[PDB]
């Protein structure tokens, strides 16, 4: 259409024509569905647009050109590659330092799409030292800019395989710690995602998150009126409790248990699922933390979900109760408590799920219950294992016996031993 003329105008030496042309390119690219990215790329104007972002170029030109490149980078890795190979990244970064506010708003968005393309482009942007100028944007007192920068910042932290350069992304913790206190929902959401990414890693990363005192706030955000905030905050909390017993205790001390208790009755199924997931990693802790969960009255509602929640959630509830049962070896009463709360019936019923990882998890729990029951019997001269009688009455014996027919050897081995040992 105008593209042929637009291309010629863009390469013109007249600046009025360059700007008119750049704006048209920005306009045709501003489409959410099926943007004319390839047509613009093939017009061969990317290097020219990148050229308009140079430091001494007219402001409007830098602005429109960066905006256009921003949307080209919003495409596939192939289309994004064109922008990157044209050396646009280092220019986006410099614009973050010298550009007018409007210009910076384009540049940071562009960096957001580039870093969000893949681990390599994420690393590339980090290698170009984008972190420093980016963290600087949070002192702008500019909402729109901060929102985009928070998002961009999260893409720089995102990715577990490969994990981003920790020595660089860790630099953003102090900033993220303050951002989760923002009243702007949009910024808060992205800050929480960023944090969940940084929290998703080695012991030192979780510890760095704990050291800046982020957990206290994450727990409070679990009750934020929007699930858009609850989801990431809960994710960050969950990732943190995948840490050691000490790190996990910090989260417990920040009062996560009562909060999780409320999440167990959330209207959103994924919230209930992740709340159980989070509890499962706490009951995977030491004796005291398993007891803390017990004292926080999480078992009853956990048992309820185990019996009536959607499968994905039930599986998570199963992990929690099962990890908790592993503590009975050190404290039998934990098993007595679990059984008194009716975990046996739901656990057995779950033996028929189409997930072997869960069958194993359930068989282990039932065995932890069987062992305690056996020890109690041995302890006080009885000849009947009370918990074995409970399992049989719950129809669990028949189900366990059937797991022996599972093609999975591990399942088979577990079921067999349980049957021959307690039944």
């Amino acid at each position: 259409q105008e593209l042929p003329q637009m291309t010629q105008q863009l390469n013109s030496d007249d600046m009025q024509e360059q700007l008119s042309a750049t704006v048209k390119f920005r306009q045709i690219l501003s489409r959410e569905h099926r943007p004319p990215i390839d047509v613009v790329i093939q017009a061969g104007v990317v290097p020219r647009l990148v050229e308009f972002m140079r430091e001494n170029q007219p402001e409007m030109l830098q602005l429109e050109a960066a905006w256009a490149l921003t949307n080209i980078a919003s495409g596939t890795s192939a289309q994004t590659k064109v922008v990157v190979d044209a050396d646009a990244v280092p220019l986006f970064i410099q614009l973050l330092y010298t550009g007018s506010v409007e210009v910076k708003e384009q540049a940071i968005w562009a960096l957001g799409n580039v870093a969000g393309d893949s681990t390599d482009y994420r690393d590339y942007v980090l290698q170009c030292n984008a972190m420093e100028p980016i963290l600087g944007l949070f002192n702008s007192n500019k909402p729109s800019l901060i929102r985009t920068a928070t998002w961009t910042l999260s893409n720089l932290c995102r990715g577990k395989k490969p994990q981003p350069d920790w020595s660089v992304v860790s630099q953003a913790l102090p900033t993220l710690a303050k951002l989760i206190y923002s009243m702007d929902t949009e910024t808060l959401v992205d800050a929480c995602w960023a944090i969940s990414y940084l929290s998703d890693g080695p012991q030192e990363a979780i510890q760095a998150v704990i050291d800046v005192r982020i957990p206290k706030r994450l727990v409070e955000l679990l009750s934020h009126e929007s699930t858009l905030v609850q989801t990431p905050a809960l994710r960050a909390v969950g990732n943190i409790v995948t840490g050691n017993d000490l790190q996990t205790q910090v989260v417990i001390n920040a009062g996560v248990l009562p909060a999780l208790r409320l999440l167990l009755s959330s209207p959103k199924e994924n919230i209930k699922k992740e709340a159980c997931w989070t509890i499962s990693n706490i009951t995977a802790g030491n004796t005291e933390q398993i007891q803390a969960v017990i004292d926080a009255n999480l078992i009853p509602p956990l048992v309820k979900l185990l019996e009536v929640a959607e499968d994905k959630t039930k599986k998570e509830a199963c992990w929690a109760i099962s990890n908790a049962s592993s503590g009975g070896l050190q404290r039998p009463d934990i098993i007595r408590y679990l059984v008194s709360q009716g975990c046996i019936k739901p656990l057995c019923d779950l033996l028929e799920i189409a997930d072997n990882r869960i069958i194993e998890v359930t068989l282990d729990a039932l065995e932890n219950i069987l062992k305690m029951g056996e020890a109690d019997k041995e302890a006080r001269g009885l000849n009947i294992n009370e918990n074995a009688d409970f399992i049989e009455k719950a129809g669990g014996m028949e189900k366990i016996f059937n797991c022996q027919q599972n093609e999975n050897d591990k399942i088979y081995e577990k079921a067999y031993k349980i049957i021959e040992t307690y039944f």
């Binding site: 577990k160 969950g238 990732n239 995948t242 997931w277 990693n281």
Partner: peptide
């Protein structure tokens, strides 16, 4: 302890 993918 189970981590995300």
């Amino acid at each position: 302890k189970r981590v995300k993918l």
